[PDB]
Design a protein around this ligand. Sequence first.
Ligand code: PLX
Ligand code: PLX
Ligand code: PEE
Lengths: 459, 57
Amino acid sequence: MLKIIIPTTMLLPMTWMSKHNMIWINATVHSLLISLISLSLLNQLGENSLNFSLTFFSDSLSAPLLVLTTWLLPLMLMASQSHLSKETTTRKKLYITMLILLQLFLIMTFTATELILFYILFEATLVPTLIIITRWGNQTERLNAGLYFLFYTLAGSLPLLVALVYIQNTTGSLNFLIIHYWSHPLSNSWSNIFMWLACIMAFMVKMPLYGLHLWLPKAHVEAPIAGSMVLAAVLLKLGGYGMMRITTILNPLTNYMAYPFLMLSMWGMIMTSSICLRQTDLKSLIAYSSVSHMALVIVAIMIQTPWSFMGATALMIAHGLTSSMLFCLANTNYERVHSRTMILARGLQTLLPLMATWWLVASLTNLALPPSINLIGELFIITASFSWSNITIILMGMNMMITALYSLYMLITTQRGKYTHHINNIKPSFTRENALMALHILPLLLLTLNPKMILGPLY
Amino acid sequence: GWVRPDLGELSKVTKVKTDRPLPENPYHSRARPEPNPEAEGDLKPAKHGSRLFFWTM
Ligand SMILES: CCCCCCCCCCCCCCCCC[C@@H](O)O[C@H](CO[C@H](O)CCCCCCCCCCCCCCC)COP(=O)(O)OCC[N+](C)(C)C
Ligand SMILES: CCCCCCCCCCCCCCCCC[C@@H](O)O[C@H](CO[C@H](O)CCCCCCCCCCCCCCC)COP(=O)(O)OCC[N+](C)(C)C
Ligand SMILES: CCCCCCCC/C=C\CCCCCCCC(=O)O[C@H](COC(=O)CCCCCCC/C=C/CCCCCCCC)COP(=O)(O)OCCN
């Protein structure tokens, strides 16, 4: 794997010795080049994995997430190029350094053949994010948001460390291959119940599960644009990836320990979808949409059937790309408007037609329109849950209808209607924003042609 | 015909020729417990390094 990790590390000296007016160009070019290198990992085989060495291994679950992580960084740089114009060279270089460190930690996390190394990098991914949120944030609530994001995650993930070291003491190894091959059933006991809770809660808090999602709207609203996309696209998938990796040792306890979380997610999807309808903010609406989709992913993972896992992976990738696009569009609107309110600027389609087209495409993809991978993952999870129980279809259909409703409400309120009269600084959209939207959307419509690349190991 | 001992004579250490057998164990001590194995050998490099979590060296 080192052919990927080493260039990401070399991105730091490359950035720090660049000229004052050429950091963005170099960072973007070499990030894109790195993404091309990461494409080779996608060719997985039906057998075990691509066991590179004793420390790193790649599966067909890690490959799509790794490619998405490597692809996101150029988009983050193009998004951050706007509001960092009046920033000193040292602070811009520090921002790029934080982004590069985040990418490096995520890359090392997603392979992480050993569970303790996975946990170490999984918590290491928390420092650059907190620095980005609390330093380059506009509102005065970024401090409280950073505190919430830190503590909600750390409180859940601290018992996970104890559970992992206990498992190593009893089992004798935490390597995922040995863990998978030597797995033994968990007896129904209070100690095993608490081991299950410790191993699960750390990933359920980050997903997030309904009832522990309070940190997500704050972190997404107060963060800068790049922090928002990296939170919505990749950082939410860490919990689901960890849960799908670690549910291999919790059987057969899960068969009855999944009921509270299944009920919480299947009701919180409806609750957050309804919340999206009555929202005065755009970024908050998108954050709640992300919560709903991640609740569906939680249900899929807890069902634990092959179709559930395939749909979960597809929905992970699709939601990451869609949420990143939606946050990009909201940021472009906010930069001209400087208000971040849904009804303050209206009828923008008459003034910016191409951005209206991008809004329509993003809303349609979020609406789970066929044959996009959004609906592929959605439908796989729906069929798996229907096999689990015939009554889930009611909740899932209600969620689908409310999702369509709030997506088209978001489109209509900001694009259709009569323009607001007292706003006269809606300049024509730059080439940077159009290119950003195109690079967000084209991979989705391209992946809809080859779904097997994002359907996970149980394909 | 007795000669008084001079200075430094009565404080001399002397030898006694006696037929009383030398006591073999005057302290009435028990048997000393067996010592530790104190094994020996040639050192070899640690098997698979430190074996501390994910460290391969
Ligand atoms: C008509 C043709 C149509 C199809 C064209 C397809 C072209 C594909 C090009 C894109 C390739 C994607 C990158 C793939 C990287 C993964 C593979 C890579 O890691 O392999 C390395 C090798 O990589 C190549 O040497 C270098 C390729 C890098 C460049 C790819 C071509 C495009 C580069 C564009 C860069 C910018 C161009 C100039 C712009 C100004 C190391 O290989 P190694 O592990 O040892 O192999 C061991 C097995 N052996 C012994 C049999 C070999
Ligand atoms: C708030 C936002 C979400 C946060 C996370 C929510 C998820 C946490 C909920 C925990 C999941 C279930 C916990 C225990 C499940 C075991 C089943 C048990 O509850 O049912 C009965 C257990 O009886 C009673 O429940 C005993 C436990 C009563 C005390 C527990 C507290 C109950 C209310 C507290 C709720 C607080 C939750 C949040 C804390 C901050 C069955 O009796 P029995 O068959 O004999 O024993 C089965 C176990 N055996 C087989 C190993 C022996
Ligand atoms: C966003 C906030 C979320 C907070 C999450 C916190 C709750 C996480 C679940 C409990 C965490 C502690 C579990 C302990 C770690 C697992 C270790 C383990 O499994 O070892 C058990 C030990 O089990 C325990 O010791 C558990 C004791 C728990 C003490 C701490 C209680 C913390 C709160 C409990 C209730 C929380 C549960 C619901 C939380 C919902 C989220 C708020 C086996 O014991 P042995 O010694 O091997 O016995 C074998 C011989 N018969």
